[PDB]
């Protein structure tokens, strides 16, 4: 009743000779759907999907004042051109600007970071590793279904940070909007520790329902990153959630 | 020069056998642009663009608890099908649901509505007429440049309501988002007093600037309503604000 497996969605992965999981949660009906119940519960490094809780914590502690505060480029040229510039919270989430969030994490510090992930009930709650890289190559692990549980709390302003912090992070998560739906989401790409995977987690707002989603997929090269959104959207289309 | 007139935009109205004004404001440069300085400063009924201030006031007074509160359809069949359903603040804005906002206005009441529009410096601040219809056929008037002035305060959380109220209304204004821009805006259609006009007011968020806009145009029939957005976007494209 609560979770239903739809193996027909595997066709959207084998289409591209790829492997992964899409997890959906119908908020109105309190019912979940996935192509792979086991992998839906397999826990991986969050990689840049960790920017959602990191943002919440940085805002609630005042490390980030608001979504307009500028974090200046430190002058080090990195391999991702969009990182080599000034950012605010909105553009730092849009371009997954790791070095900006590493500064947040150092200012938050290990103790507060650990306590807040416990308060959030986030994944395995384990920040072992460098305080500014554990979500990329440390001990923290989270599954797609755990991502959904966390996102539902955020959607409902039920996380143990201020309402304001939650509203700002949901603004920064804005990814796509049109007359048919709004998507608030965050991508991730885990490359430092095997298995290399891509993530996309968030939700689709409709007029009268919300569909939460979390997907990950094997990602041996960066060439396939667009499949994170494309496969998710094929599932959403199949299930008549978006046109 | 603070204000510049660009009459070449008139071609975008003439193309459609129309007349109107677009007003743009470059926030970084503090410079404004319009095709018609006179009409930019002529005042019209706000019609449904009034849902921006009405939302703010309803939220700040607690008439509306939050963006999820459901305003049940009163069961009176109206001729706009999307009005014959339950709404929250988000969908009421999206579908310009007049009867929901009329009830907001009744609960706000004349005295508080008047005081708040003065605090907002909103248009001619005149609510003469019926409290449940003055933005459709009463004495209130606002120009395109006055819409920009009000919207800039909202963007900066500088209106005399809480930050929370302003964030909620800006969420409810969300109209379009993609990798290139975000538009937050509200349409309007004034038919009860001549000249009948259409409005579109809001702003375009870019990575490193905001462009505020306010347009109105003659609208003898509802068949032309899509020109509000189409003409605005042609101006935005011409000025290399959006691709
Ligand atoms: O989520 C992404 O879309 C993405 C994330 C990263 C990244 C995130 C965190 N630590 C390192 C890299 C890198 C890239 C990328 C794009 C093109 N060519 C190479 C890499 C894309
Ligand atoms: O875009 C508009 O400005 C507009 C759109 C609708 C509408 C929304 C959804 N489905 C159909 C029409 C209704 C109205 C309206 C405003 C005031 N008095 C009556 C009608 C105006
Ligand atoms: Cl938003």
Swiss-Prot record, chains A, B:
Induction, per UniProt: Expressed from an upstream promoter, P(out), in an insertion sequence IS1999.
Pfam families (alphabetical): Transpeptidase
Modifications made to the protein after synthesis: Carboxylated on the epsilon-amino group of a lysine, with the resulting carbamate functional group serving as a general base. Probably N-carboxylated at Lys-51 at neutral pH in vivo and undergoes complete N-decarboxylation, at pH 4.1, in vitro.
EC number(s) given by UniProt: 3.5.2.6
GO biological process: antibiotic catabolic process; cell wall organization; response to antibiotic
MF (Gene Ontology): beta-lactamase activity; penicillin binding
Gene3D superfamilies (alphabetical): DD-peptidase/beta-lactamase superfamily
Cellular compartments per GO CC: plasma membrane
Matches recorded under NCBIfam families: bla_class_D_main, blaOXA-48_like
Family the UniProt entry places it in: Belongs to the class-D beta-lactamase family.
Primary role: Class D beta-lactamase which confers resistance to the beta-lactam antibiotics, including amoxicillin, and moderate resistance to cephalosporins and carbapenems such as cephalothin and imipenem; in the DH10B strain of E.coli. Acts via hydrolysis of the beta-lactam ring. Has oxacillin-, cephalothin- and imipenem-hydrolyzing activities.
Protein known as: Beta-lactamase OXA-48
Taxonomy of the source species: Bacteria, Pseudomonadati, Pseudomonadota, Gammaproteobacteria, Enterobacterales
Gene from which the chain derives: OXA-48
